[PDB]
Amino acid sequence: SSQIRQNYSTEVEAAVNRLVNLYLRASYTYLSLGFYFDRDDVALEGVCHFFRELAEEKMEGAERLLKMQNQRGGRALFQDLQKPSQDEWGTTPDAMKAAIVLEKSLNQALLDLHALGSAQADPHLCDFLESHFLDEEVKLIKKMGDHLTNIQRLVGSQAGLGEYLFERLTL
Amino acid sequence: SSQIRQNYSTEVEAAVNRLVNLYLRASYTYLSLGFYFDRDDVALEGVCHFFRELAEEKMEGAERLLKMQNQRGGRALFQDLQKPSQDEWGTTPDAMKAAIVLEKSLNQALLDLHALGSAQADPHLCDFLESHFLDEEVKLIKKMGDHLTNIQRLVGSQAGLGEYLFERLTL
Amino acid sequence: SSQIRQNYSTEVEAAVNRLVNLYLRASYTYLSLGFYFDRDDVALEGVCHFFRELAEEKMEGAERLLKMQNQRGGRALFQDLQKPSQDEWGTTPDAMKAAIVLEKSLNQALLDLHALGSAQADPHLCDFLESHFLDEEVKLIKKMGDHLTNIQRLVGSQAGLGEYLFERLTL
Amino acid sequence: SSQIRQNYSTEVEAAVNRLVNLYLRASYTYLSLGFYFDRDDVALEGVCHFFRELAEEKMEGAERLLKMQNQRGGRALFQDLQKPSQDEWGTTPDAMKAAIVLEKSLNQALLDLHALGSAQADPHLCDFLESHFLDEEVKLIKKMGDHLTNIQRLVGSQAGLGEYLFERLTL
Amino acid sequence: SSQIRQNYSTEVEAAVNRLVNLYLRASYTYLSLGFYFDRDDVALEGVCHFFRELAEEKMEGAERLLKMQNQRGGRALFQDLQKPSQDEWGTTPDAMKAAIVLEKSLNQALLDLHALGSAQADPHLCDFLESHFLDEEVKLIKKMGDHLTNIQRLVGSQAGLGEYLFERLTL
Amino acid sequence: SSQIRQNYSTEVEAAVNRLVNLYLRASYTYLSLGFYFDRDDVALEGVCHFFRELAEEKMEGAERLLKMQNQRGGRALFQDLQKPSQDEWGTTPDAMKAAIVLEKSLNQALLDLHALGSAQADPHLCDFLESHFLDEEVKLIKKMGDHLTNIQRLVGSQAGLGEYLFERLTL
């Protein structure tokens, strides 16, 4: 058996592996979003940078989960990573909407894992999530909603011009 | 059509997408190797760090290929990423052997893409590969072979003790 | 005969002279583009600066080719330089389109010279081009395509206002 | 019509365009002189540098004229540039003599334009020329005459040896 | 067999060994040239230094080839080194002519090895040569031709005096 | 005859030339030893560095002898250099034993030359050797014997493990 494992359920161990897969999928989605905005026929550098930075953040999140898995005496198990849900991501508001969907899905997975840890009386897990993930997600989703409101307000006025201004003056 | 694309074949465009998938798969394999060596029942920090650094290098390689795809006017297309070939990676020599196999597979893919670019009279591709990939792979494979020789020499003597010394004094 | 010339064909020597003429013509075209955008009835300083900087880059390219001609033992021969294809260059998108045409013509000349050097088994020429010209052209054409997309997106919205914003916020 | 143009005759506007062509031709001539002295069978680095620096000075002069054209509300018009008068430039004294001929031709063009501006009662033009061109030409022609005297004195003694010494100790 | 060797032909491996022998022979030739110019009855320090520096450069070139041999998984094999072709090297122009002959022989060996690598579809070899050897040789041969022209021009005038001036003012 | 030569026998002059050949042969032997330890199937970096540094030291020794030859008014004469006595150098103790043999052969040549200078009443030669060569050899041979004792003590215990430890902790 494991020489360090203590109070760490098989249910949480498996849920952590699943959450790593979700974070890695999210990183992959952001990689695709970033390089789409880098295309010469899209060409919105601030948008490209926004999403490439998020790809790195989600990879960091997976790495933190993996480190914790090992700290607790669980075993990291990796599964196939599904490709992103789109090959082309539309306009800036389309992309920001997709990102908000993706983050809410990550947040609901965090909340579900939190509920599981609370059911399993695993306060280390519950602290880990609260400390490194839950407020990060709330902050990020607030930022994204702020961005979406701004983008929508701009492209409602004049779509091309508004998308340019947002990229130049916000991102 | 594309406003910048010039001398960039559909064959090379598709081969670049495939090579990105290979680099991303390699990064994933190294992620798994790294966290395996971080397990409390494996516990070889230098080995863990060696492989986690390689995971980052392969991700950088994918990003460079994606950037080039867009510079040339091609379209990045992402596919599902297959999980690594093992869940547990054995001893240090087992892991180093697997890494050498993986690098040789990347190198042969680079060489094949190079041959294709030469067939397609695409000197920008050929320069890109030579400049950023081909010598990197040769250097890395030489390092890995040096490491393997050292590990084998050590574990032939006394397996536990030799693995510890390698991790402490080389890595 | 020449005391240093070695593996340097008469065909490549002549093609290098022709390419110098092309680079000098390009520099002249950019000089004209730059000063057109400096006119008090055009008055787009960022555009003026963009093109004047390109005039200097193309002159640098001619000078590098001339230096190489002499390094190889060939003889620089100069021909008349044709004036630019227009006296007035229209709007920003008109000018950016013309620039992309001009760069693609330079790039195809580089590629043709590369093919010739490969036919003549002249690896020094092939390395020289790859090192100093081919990636520079790919980067520049990508930048220009990014700019064109942005300009078009802006002037589609509102032509005067969009042209101003591009010059102010991108250039 | 032009919103800024004031006291700027069509005659001066056209003469300024012609003078730009003369400056650009001169720059081209110096480019050729410079690279001739860079040939491995000529190999006088100080001479090469002397003339390449002059090529840059004459380009600066054209740019100053173009800037002024626009400041005054005139329209820059470019014509074909004739290739230099020779493909090979002889010995150092031959080259210095050619340069003095070329500068005197530029100076006489400046003086003619000055006389025209005085006929047209255009004191801004007259000040511009006096400030940026006329004393520059007098200084340069004096330097060139000093150089020629020195070269002639040296090559009268012993031609090869004198040409070397001049390049080493003056240039 | 070799654990790292990949795409590295026996033909290139042997040709690299031969080229090392050529570089080492060249270094030896330059050692002899350098110490000849150090003789009290020759006494041209700048010439001595020119050639001793070249002896070191050629040794560096051999070392780079040897390093690459091992990086690729080939086996360095050394052969007897033939003594230089002369015991005494004449005047400065005699020595510079010999050096140009020697460099052209090195350059033709590089070109031949390049052609072989291209026949063997070995792009790493081809990049290695282009990157570290081919432009170095072109630059060096250009310098040597410049020097020879200068020396010849000087000793045509007055042989003793010209040789002194070259050593003092160029070297 | 020579204008500076004084008290410098033909016997010593010839013996100095022979000793240069011995030093150059030794440098070549160390070059081969160094690159053997750089092979991916040998892979002992500290050993490689030890011997490559010695190759440079022996070349320095040849250069000092050549400089002295000229200071004394003798004439440097170079002979063919024989390749090293082995193509592969075995284990670390095998290599260190070979090095000690080689150094003792250099030292006996120094001692013989010293005896000759004493027979020829040449105190400058005798001082030169004592000052720059004889104590260097004694120090180096002592170091090598220290190393050999350590290596032997280690590989007697456990051969692979001991060779690794020596390279890591001594070299």
Which parts of B are annotated binding residues for Fe cation?
53, 56-57, 60, 63
C36: which residues sit within 8 A by CB, 6+ positions away? C42, C88, C89, C95, D76
* Rounded Cα gap, residues F28 and D7, in angstroms: 83
In the block, residue with structure tokens 């002499």: C70
Q: Identify all chain B residues contacting C118, using CB atoms and an 8 Å cutoff.
A: 121, 123
Q: What's the one-letter identity of residue E70?
A: N
Selected residue of A168, A169, A171 to mutate for chain C interface (largest C Cβ count, 10 A) = A168
Q: CB-based contact (8 Å) between F85 and chain E?
A: no
* Rounded Cα gap, residues C21 and C27, in angstroms: 10
Give DSSP secondary structure letters for chain A: --SS--S--HHHHHHHHHHHHHHHHHHHHHHHHHHHHTSTTT--HHHHHHHHHHHHHHHHHHHHHHHHHHHHT------PBPPPS-S---SHHHHHHHHHHHHHHHHHHHHHHHHHHHHTT-HHHHHHHIIIIIHHHHHHHHHHHHHHHHHHHHHHH-HHHHHHHHHHHT-
Q: Identify all chain C residues contacting B126, using CB atoms and an 8 Å cutoff.
A: 130
> Nearest CA of chain A to the CA of B73: how many Å?
7
Full 3-state SS string of chain E: CCCCCCCCCHHHHHHHHHHHHHHHHHHHHHHHHHHHHCCCCCCCHHHHHHHHHHHHHHHHHHHHHHHHHHHHCCCCCCCCECCCCCCCCCCHHHHHHHHHHHHHHHHHHHHHHHHHHHHCCCHHHHHHHHHHHHHHHHHHHHHHHHHHHHHHHHHHHCHHHHHHHHHHHCC
All domains of chain D in start order, with CATH: 1-171 (1.20.1260.10)
Q: CB-based contact (8 Å) between B140 and chain F?
A: no
> Please, are residues D12 and D120 in contact by the beta-carbon 8 Å criterion?
yes
Q: CB-based contact (8 Å) between B139 and chain F?
A: no
Helix spans in chain C (H): 10-37, 45-72, 92-119, 123-129, 135-157, 159-169
Q: CB-based contact (8 Å) between A83 and chain B?
A: yes
Residue D124 token pair: 């801004």
Which parts of F are annotated binding residues for Fe cation?
53, 56-57, 60, 63
> Please, are residues F11 and F113 in contact by the beta-carbon 8 Å criterion?
no
Contacts of A8-12 spanning 24+ positions with Cβ under 8 A: A8/A72, A8/A73, A8/A74, A8/A122, A9/A120, A9/A122, A11/A116, A11/A120, A12/A74, A12/A113, A12/A116, A12/A117, A12/A120, A12/A122, A12/A125
Selected residue of C40, C49, C68, C79 to mutate for chain D interface (largest D Cβ count, 10 A) = C40
CB count, 10 Å around CB of D14?
A: 14
Residue B104 token pair: 């040789």
DSSP lists the bridge partners of residue C81 as D81
In the block, residue with structure tokens 């994204």: A144
> Please, are residues E82 and E21 in contact by the beta-carbon 8 Å criterion?
no
Q: Do C153 and A165 touch (CB under 8 A)?
A: no
Rg (C-alpha) for chain A, rounded Å, is 18
Q: Give the three-state DSSP class for D6.
A: coil
> Nearest CA of chain E to the CA of D168: how many Å?
7
Q: CB-based contact (8 Å) between A43 and chain B?
A: no
DSSP-derived secondary structure letter, D82: P
Q: Do A66 and B40 touch (CB under 8 A)?
A: no
* Maximum alpha-carbon separation in chain F: 64
Which uninterrupted H or E stretch holds D27?
helix D10-37
DSSP lists the bridge partners of residue E9 as none
Q: Do C78 and D87 touch (CB under 8 A)?
A: yes
> Please, are residues B80 and A80 in contact by the beta-carbon 8 Å criterion?
yes
* Rounded Cα gap, residues D42 and C32, in angstroms: 35
> Please, are residues F59 and F25 in contact by the beta-carbon 8 Å criterion?
no
Give the angle subtended at the CA of E87 by the CAs of E85 and E90, to the nearest 5°.
Answer: 95
Classify the C-alpha dihedral F130-F131-F135-F136 as positive or negative: negative
> Nearest CA of chain E to the CA of C72: how many Å?
7
Q: Give the three-state DSSP class for D74.
A: coil
Q: Do C124 and E139 touch (CB under 8 A)?
A: no
> Please, are residues E149 and D43 in contact by the beta-carbon 8 Å criterion?
yes
- Per-residue CA distances from A78 to A81, B23, B29, F60 (Å): 9, 17, 10, 58
Residue A45 counted as an annotated binding residue: no
Q: Do A161 and C150 touch (CB under 8 A)?
A: no
Phi, psi of D117 (to 5 degrees): -60, -40
> Please, are residues A55 and B63 in contact by the beta-carbon 8 Å criterion?
no
Residue A56 counted as an annotated binding residue: yes
Q: Which residue of E has its CA nearest to F82?
A: E80
> Please, are residues B22 and B86 in contact by the beta-carbon 8 Å criterion?
no
Q: CB-based contact (8 Å) between E171 and chain D?
A: no
CB count, 10 Å around CB of E87?
A: 12
Give DSSP secondary structure letters for D103-123: HHHHHHHHHHHHHHHHHTT-H
Q: What's the one-letter identity of residue E45?
A: E
> Please, are residues E34 and E48 in contact by the beta-carbon 8 Å criterion?
yes
CB count, 10 Å around CB of E8?
A: 22
Measure CA of the first residue to CA of the last residue in chain E; give whole Å: 51
* Rounded Cα gap, residues F30 and B28, in angstroms: 43
* Rounded Cα gap, residues D13 and D74, in angstroms: 6
* Rounded Cα gap, residues F21 and E32, in angstroms: 12
> Nearest CA of chain D to the CA of E140: how many Å?
12
Q: What's the one-letter identity of residue B64?
A: R
Q: CB-based contact (8 Å) between C153 and chain A?
A: yes
* Rounded Cα gap, residues C107 and C100, in angstroms: 10
Classify the C-alpha dihedral A150-A155-A158-A159 as positive or negative: positive
Q: What's the one-letter identity of residue F129?
A: L
Residue E164 token pair: 């002194």
> Please, are residues A152 and A92 in contact by the beta-carbon 8 Å criterion?
no
* Rounded Cα gap, residues F11 and F113, in angstroms: 10
Q: CB-based contact (8 Å) between B1 and chain C?
A: no
> Please, are residues C137 and C107 in contact by the beta-carbon 8 Å criterion?
yes
Q: Give the three-state DSSP class for D25.
A: helix
> Please, are residues B22 and B109 in contact by the beta-carbon 8 Å criterion?
yes
* Rounded Cα gap, residues B57 and B141, in angstroms: 14
Chains C and F physically touch (3 or more Cβ atom pairs below 8 Å): no
Q: After which residues is chain E broken (C to N over 2.5 A)?
A: none
> Nearest CA of chain B to the CA of A21: how many Å?
10
Q: What's the one-letter identity of residue C146?
A: D
> Please, are residues A34 and B59 in contact by the beta-carbon 8 Å criterion?
no
Q: Identify all chain F residues contacting B97, using CB atoms and an 8 Å cutoff.
A: none
F56: which residues sit within 8 A by CB, 6+ positions away? F27
Q: Give the three-state DSSP class for B42.
A: coil
Q: What's the one-letter identity of residue C115?
A: A
Residue E12 token pair: 């290139």
* Rounded Cα gap, residues D39 and D36, in angstroms: 5
> Please, are residues F42 and F122 in contact by the beta-carbon 8 Å criterion?
no
Chains F and D physically touch (3 or more Cβ atom pairs below 8 Å): no
B138: which residues sit within 8 A by CB, 6+ positions away? B107, E71, E72, E124
Classify the C-alpha dihedral F89-F91-F94-F96 as positive or negative: positive
Give the technique used to solve this structure. Answer: X-ray
Residue count (chain D): 171
> Nearest CA of chain E to the CA of C64: how many Å?
13
Helices F45-72 & F159-169, crossing angle to 10 degrees? 60
Residue B36 token pair: 């395996």
> Please, are residues C62 and C20 in contact by the beta-carbon 8 Å criterion?
yes
> Nearest CA of chain D to the CA of C158: how many Å?
24
* Rounded Cα gap, residues E156 and D155, in angstroms: 13
* Rounded Cα gap, residues A125 and A131, in angstroms: 10
In the block, residue with structure tokens 């022709």: C18
Q: CB-based contact (8 Å) between D41 and chain E?
A: yes
Q: CB-based contact (8 Å) between A35 and chain B?
A: yes
Residue A128 token pair: 């880990």
Q: Give the three-state DSSP class for C8.
A: coil
Label residue F89 exposed, middle or buried (CB < 10 Å: 0-12, 13-18, 19+).
buried
* Rounded Cα gap, residues F117 and F109, in angstroms: 12
In the block, residue with structure tokens 């004084």: F6
Residue E42 token pair: 């020759």
> Nearest CA of chain D to the CA of E64: how many Å?
29
Q: Which residue of D has its CA nearest to E170?
A: D168
* Rounded Cα gap, residues A6 and D134, in angstroms: 91
Residue E68 token pair: 């690459």
D141: which residues sit within 8 A by CB, 6+ positions away? D100, D103, D104, D107
Give the angle subtended at the CA of E167 by the CAs of E166 and F2, to the nearest 5°.
Answer: 125
Q: Identify all chain D residues contacting E169, using CB atoms and an 8 Å cutoff.
A: 164, 168-169
Q: Identify all chain E residues contacting C64, using CB atoms and an 8 Å cutoff.
A: none
Phi, psi of A81 (to 5 degrees): -100, 120
Out of A32, A75, A80, name the one closest to residue B83 (CB).
A80
Q: What's the one-letter identity of residue B89?
A: W
Residue A53 counted as an annotated binding residue: yes
Out of E3, E71, E126, name the one closest to residue B100 (CB).
E3
* Rounded Cα gap, residues C5 and F9, in angstroms: 48
The string over E138-160, giving b where at least 16 C-beta atoms fall within 10 Å of a residue's C-beta and e elsewhere, is bebbbbbbbbbbbbbbbbebeee
Q: Identify all chain C residues contacting B3, using CB atoms and an 8 Å cutoff.
A: 100, 145, 148-149
* Rounded Cα gap, residues F155 and F171, in angstroms: 16
Give DSSP secondary structure letters for chain F: --SS--S--HHHHHHHHHHHHHHHHHHHHHHHHHHHHTSTTT--HHHHHHHHHHHHHHHHHHHHHHHHHHHHT------PBPPPS-S---SHHHHHHHHHHHHHHHHHHHHHHHHHHHHTT-HHHHHHHIIIIIHHHHHHHHHHHHHHHHHHHHHHH-HHHHHHHHHHHT-
Q: CB-based contact (8 Å) between B165 and chain F?
A: yes
* Rounded Cα gap, residues A107 and A129, in angstroms: 11
Q: CB-based contact (8 Å) between C129 and chain B?
A: yes
Q: CB-based contact (8 Å) between F115 and chain B?
A: no
Resolution (angstroms) stands at 1.4
Closest by Cα among C58, C131, C45 to C99: C58
In the block, residue with structure tokens 């230099």: D84
Q: Identify all chain C residues contacting E145, using CB atoms and an 8 Å cutoff.
A: 3-4, 73
Residue A51 token pair: 């999403």
Closest by Cα among C72, C54, C70 to C171: C54
* Rounded Cα gap, residues B145 and B151, in angstroms: 10
* Rounded Cα gap, residues B13 and B20, in angstroms: 11
Residue F144 CA to its chain's centroid (Å): 12
Phi, psi of E14 (to 5 degrees): -70, -40
> Please, are residues B67 and A38 in contact by the beta-carbon 8 Å criterion?
yes
Phi, psi of C81 (to 5 degrees): -100, 120
C73: which residues sit within 8 A by CB, 6+ positions away? C2, C3, C4, C5, C6, C8, D40, E145
Q: Identify all chain E residues contacting C121, using CB atoms and an 8 Å cutoff.
A: 111, 115, 118
Q: Do E114 and C127 touch (CB under 8 A)?
A: no
Q: Which residue of F has its CA nearest to B140?
A: F40
CB count, 10 Å around CB of C95?
A: 23
B167: which residues sit within 8 A by CB, 6+ positions away? B44, B45, B46, B47, B92
Q: CB-based contact (8 Å) between C159 and chain A?
A: no
> Please, are residues C126 and B123 in contact by the beta-carbon 8 Å criterion?
yes
Residue B60 token pair: 């950088």
Q: Give the three-state DSSP class for C43.
A: coil
Selected residue of B72, B75, B127, B131 to mutate for chain C interface (largest C Cβ count, 10 A) = B127
Q: Give the three-state DSSP class for B1.
A: coil
* Rounded Cα gap, residues A29 and A41, in angstroms: 20
Rg (C-alpha) for chain D, rounded Å, is 18
Q: Identify all chain C residues contacting E139, using CB atoms and an 8 Å cutoff.
A: 71
Q: Identify all chain B residues contacting E127, using CB atoms and an 8 Å cutoff.
A: 130-131, 134-135
Closest by Cα among F20, F12, F5 to F122: F12
